[PDB]
Design an enzyme around this catalytic site. Structure first.
Site, short mmCIF file in Angstrom:
data_model
loop_
_atom_site.label_atom_id
_atom_site.label_comp_id
_atom_site.label_asym_id
_atom_site.label_seq_id
_atom_site.Cartn_x
_atom_site.Cartn_y
_atom_site.Cartn_z
N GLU A 17 84.43 -65.81 60.41
CA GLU A 17 85.61 -66.44 61.02
C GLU A 17 85.25 -66.96 62.39
O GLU A 17 84.33 -66.45 63.03
CB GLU A 17 86.80 -65.47 61.13
CG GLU A 17 87.57 -65.24 59.84
CD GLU A 17 87.03 -64.05 59.05
OE1 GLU A 17 86.16 -63.26 59.57
OE2 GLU A 17 87.47 -63.90 57.90
N1 HHA Z 1 85.75 -60.87 58.27
C1 HHA Z 1 86.63 -60.66 57.08
C2 HHA Z 1 88.05 -60.29 57.30
C3 HHA Z 1 88.34 -59.20 58.31
O1 HHA Z 1 89.40 -58.59 58.18
O2 HHA Z 1 87.55 -59.01 59.24
C4 HHA Z 1 89.05 -60.51 56.33
C5 HHA Z 1 88.72 -61.35 55.26
C6 HHA Z 1 87.47 -61.89 55.17
C7 HHA Z 1 86.54 -61.92 56.29
O3 HHA Z 1 85.23 -62.23 55.99
#
Ligand code: HHA
Ligand code: HHA
Lengths: 278, 279
Positions: A45
């Site tokens: 992200e």
């Molecule tokens: N970093 C993850 C995320 C998280 O909660 O960090 C949620 C869904 C997918 C992502 O790769």
């Protein structure tokens, strides 16, 4: 031009944990450009810090390489640690599409070391696609019922009988692409120490290093299935096999029928800082 | 210990298009093990590290995917050349690599490097000899041309698709492709001066790459060998469209099969960002 910082979330040294790129003063960027920038960075992200609209300190938009998420754990942990540097506060309230997420910052001499969030309380149900999922993962059975949890994103949990069996997984990513708007979290361990691996073509990643929004639900999962006690803190270590060890701390308070709090916390460190041309 | 870096979008004239590479300057103090880790931290198809020269070039460049080192690669070196080109008035740059010294010609516009051309290593090639396995991994029944593997440092296999629709329709089995080590699978379609490509390489740590610069040269040879263009005819190869990263590579392979005198690959590049890291 936007400044950004790279934070390694769920880590106490650079090159460990899970990177997130946090972009400041992002009010001028349309969401379609946010998405493109996240594609550019290609990290699990990137986030965008916007002026608050509902009484928090900021509004944070969260993008995988391929989609927007309404809540995510590593990205918001990293954002809270980076944002913490702007002020002296030890309490930070970050707006997301899932609502306002409260953070407690761990500071020393005003310098941010770690943070703890209160996550949205997930709901859950049976996946109802076990044969298909386990075929995809390359296994026979889950050690515990395969359930899917929703706290913005969705997370499915599949248990393995040993850490070696967890590390031995070589999932079929293409088969996993049939599982839309969800991440697959495989786990193994005992007592207060658990290992995880996460796979999500839906969220643009072959394997993620620290899935922070999965940590709280795992703790729920383990307690619902009798392996730990509600209220018992667990350490979840993810990302080891891909060279990105990430330590997530989780604690789910209350009882199955009525959870009162789902706390996830971790260290984070700055890897770098710079500026983009748009 | 701190390192400045620039993010160059190689094979594009505007940011957010093309294929990003992260270029780290003054990198001599990083052991290769740490360079590999940094390349994983950035998670771009490659990062490069600019070292002092040992053989009379301008710099020595080491090149890393998220999971392995490469002796040569085209988008990473193009971006490295554009990045280093900002620090110099010279028209040519010579970048030492493990495959020898690669010569570049830099194109400026106003006071600014906007593009470059390289002379790539002359590849060798043969058939892959594993057609059925590869084709099942790709999810198709055959290739329009013989499935051949070229080696200019890395290795590139080429599978021909009968249309652009057929190319965009591929949804390969990433795991099954991981059984092909030390190569990239380049799938192409098009005609004449205009080709589309898609590249897949679990071996090089990428589900799909946007612009595989070291494949552009070999594809022009491959097309000339197979009578679809003439040796020496420039082609445009457009890669990364389906993943939202359109990239334009220009390639020209001069000579004849038995004796190539130049494999030229060029393209535009633009700076997307820059920064510093804490190690
Ligand atoms: N970093 C993850 C995320 C998280 O909660 O960090 C949620 C869904 C997918 C992502 O790769
Ligand atoms: N960008 C690619 C590369 C290149 O020549 O650019 C070589 C091998 C794999 C990389 O993803």
């Amino acid at each position: 031009m936007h400044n950004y910082v790279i934070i390694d979330a769920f880590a106490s040294v650079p090159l460990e944990g899970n990177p997130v790129a946090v972009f400041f003063d992002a009010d001028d960027l349309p969401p379609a450009q946010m998405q493109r920038i996240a594609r550019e960075m290609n990290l699990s992200e990137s986030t965008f810090v916007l002026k608050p609209r509902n009484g928090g300190d900021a509004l944070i938009r969260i993008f995988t390489p391929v989609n927007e998420l309404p809540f995510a754990g590593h990205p918001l942990l990293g954002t809270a640690i980076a944002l913490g540097a702007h002020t002296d506060n030890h309490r930070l309230y970050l707006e997301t599409q899932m609502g306002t997420i409260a953070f407690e910052l761990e500071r020393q001499n005003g310098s941010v070391i770690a943070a703890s969030m209160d996550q949205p309380i997930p709901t859950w149900t049976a996946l109802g696609r076990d044969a298909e999922l386990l075929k995809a993962l390359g296994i026979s059975d889950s050690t515990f019922p395969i359930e899917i949890y929703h706290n913005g994103p969705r997370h499915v949990f599949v248990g393995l009988p040993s850490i070696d069996a967890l590390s031995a997984l070589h999932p079929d990513h293409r088969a996993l692409s049939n599982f839309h708007d969800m991440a697959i979290n495989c786990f193994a361990g005992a007592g207060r120490r658990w290992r995880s691996r996460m796979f999500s073509p839906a969220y643009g990643v072959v394997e993620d290093a620290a899935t922070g929004s999965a940590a709280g639900p795992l703790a729920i999962h383990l307690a619902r299935h009798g392996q730990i006690e509600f209220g018992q803190p667990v350490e979840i270590l993810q990302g080891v096999e891909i060279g990105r060890p990430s330590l997530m701390f989780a604690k789910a308070e209350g009882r199955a029928e009525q959870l009162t709090r789902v706390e996830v916390s971790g260290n984070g460190v700055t890897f770098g800082r710079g500026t983009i041309v748009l």
